[PDB]
Amino acid sequence: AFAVDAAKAYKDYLASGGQPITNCVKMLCTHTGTGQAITVTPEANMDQESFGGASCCLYCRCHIDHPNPKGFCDLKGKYVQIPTTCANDPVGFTLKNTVCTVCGMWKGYGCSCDQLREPMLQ
Amino acid sequence: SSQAWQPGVAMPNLYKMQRMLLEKCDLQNYGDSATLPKGIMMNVAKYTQLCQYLNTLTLAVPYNMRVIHFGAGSDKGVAPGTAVLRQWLPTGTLLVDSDLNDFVSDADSTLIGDCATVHTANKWDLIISDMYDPKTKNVTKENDSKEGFFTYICGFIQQKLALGGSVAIKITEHSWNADLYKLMGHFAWWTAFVTNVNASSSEAFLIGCNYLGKPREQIDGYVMHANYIFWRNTNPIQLSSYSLFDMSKFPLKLRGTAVMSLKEGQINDMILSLLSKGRLIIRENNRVVISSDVLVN
Ligand SMILES: C[n+]1cn([C@@H]2O[C@H](COP(=O)(O)OP(=O)(O)OP(=O)(O)OC[C@H]3O[C@@H](n4cnc5c(N)ncnc54)[C@H](O)[C@@H]3O)[C@@H](O)[C@H]2O)c2nc(N)[nH]c(=O)c21
Ligand SMILES: C[n+]1cn([C@@H]2O[C@H](COP(=O)(O)OP(=O)(O)OP(=O)(O)OC[C@H]3O[C@@H](n4cnc5c(N)ncnc54)[C@H](O)[C@@H]3O)[C@@H](O)[C@H]2O)c2nc(N)[nH]c(=O)c21
Ligand SMILES: C[S@@+](CC[C@H](N)C(=O)[O-])C[C@H]1O[C@@H](n2cnc3c(N)ncnc32)[C@H](O)[C@@H]1O
Ligand SMILES: [Zn+2]
Ligand SMILES: [Zn+2]
């Protein structure tokens, strides 16, 4: 039953006031993209910075197993858009926040689905 | 000068036609570093300018394009270069990278170990090498042709590069190989490219464009490497990154280049013509199978 929950160990390491995981590969883009959290190509906007998924993944970076029966990674081979105001800790940001299934934006940093984009059909 | 708004500078044709002797590479701005956009890594800027330049070439870009990238690892444990290639290459392109040391990558598949142990039964559409042996810094004798990983690449280009395929091998003043320059003569065109972000280094990417499998011209490695140092010594390049501030047309267009398996004898002058324009890629279209040898002892 023993499991080495890294996320909780990293949140505590940051709460203790520790320098976050650096060397996150930041990409060069126009900054005029959709704005979605995770994409197959840099989609940053005037308020975001795009990075390489694998370089922002705690599991990939720490050479540990991904929380999933098959052990599949959702950042590797993708590009994660991070708010310019949180770009100092891209890895920690992808853990403390979750993406939206409706618009794909970060909940709290782009998503506005809980304000009626459409009238739920009728 | 005016070549500051370009991603880099290519070795002029009149410099390749010379027959100079090898000499110490004395760059005028050696050590000077370039000003990069806030928070951008050096190898992200470098691979960006390299890709920006490749866009101007007659590269063959088919559907489900195959690209292998040797020396993709770094002493930071990440693949900035692979991240750029992943961005630049059309969505659905098969990208495989490899390094001597372990690292995290956005590649569809990563192999860890000496490129010597890397084996594959498939031909590739594009080969990118950024491999450099640190032991090269120990300059104790003449600057002679290096072997090591260059031996492998020269063989991998002949056995695993698809006709119409292109390459981009990174070299320096002391990190170079005679047989590598001789192979550039087996392509429809070639050149020594120098990124502006690293124009203060003797580094350059030898670029073969549209492999033909047969020599078009008789190049001499030692002489051609002497022509390069001479060009670099007599032509100081100013450090620039102005090409990095415009990513509007960076992605490689999916030219949908044709892919045919034409044996070894149906290669007439009408096909060599099609290979020399990136309109054709000659190789098998089976499933990609790669592997790394494990030395047990
Ligand atoms: C870059 N390049 C050069 N050549 C060869 O070299 C000759 C002159 O090409 P260059 O690159 O040395 O010329 P220049 O310095 O003047 O031009 P630049 O570097 O800007 O090359 C790119 C541009 O050249 C233009 N161009 C086309 N034909 C020529 C030509 N005959 N002379 C000069 N420029 C040309 C293209 O339209 C393109 O906009 C070409 O006629 C061709 O045989 C190539 N051949 C293939 N197959 N693929 C290439 O990618 C390639
Ligand atoms: C061209 N050059 C070489 N040397 C001397 O000769 C040595 C070997 O020369 P080199 O073949 O390494 O070429 P150069 O110095 O241009 O390479 P540079 O350090 O810019 O690195 C080139 C690229 O290789 C890779 N690389 C360099 N060092 C390492 C390393 N330790 N590990 C891994 N990759 C590395 C990187 O991608 C890097 O960008 C140099 O370390 C230096 O003492 C020079 N000295 C003067 N005064 N002026 C020069 O112009 C000059
Ligand atoms: C300049 S570093 C590559 C940096 C990387 N392209 C990046 O984007 O940061 C050169 C690499 O060559 C690798 N290398 C050197 N000799 C090698 C060999 N024989 N086989 C495989 N990789 C090798 C080193 O491990 C090193 O990571
Ligand atoms: Zn991961
Ligand atoms: Zn939403």
Curated annotation (Swiss-Prot), chain A:
Domain ExoN/MTase coactivator: 1-122
UniProt-annotated location(s): Host cytoplasm, Host perinuclear region; Host cytoplasm; Host endoplasmic reticulum
Positions with a binding annotation for Zn(2+) 7: 57, 60, 66, 73
Residues reported to bind Zn(2+) 8: 100, 103, 111, 113
Quaternary structure, from the entry: Forms a dodecamer and interacts with nsp14 and nsp16; these interactions enhance nsp14 and nsp16 enzymatic activities.
Free-text function comment from the UniProt entry: Plays a pivotal role in viral transcription by stimulating both nsp14 3'-5' exoribonuclease and nsp16 2'-O-methyltransferase activities. Therefore plays an essential role in viral mRNAs cap methylation.
Name of protein: Non-structural protein 10
Source lineage: Viruses, Riboviria, Orthornavirae, Pisuviricota, Pisoniviricetes
Location of this fragment in the whole protein: 4271 to 4392 of 7096
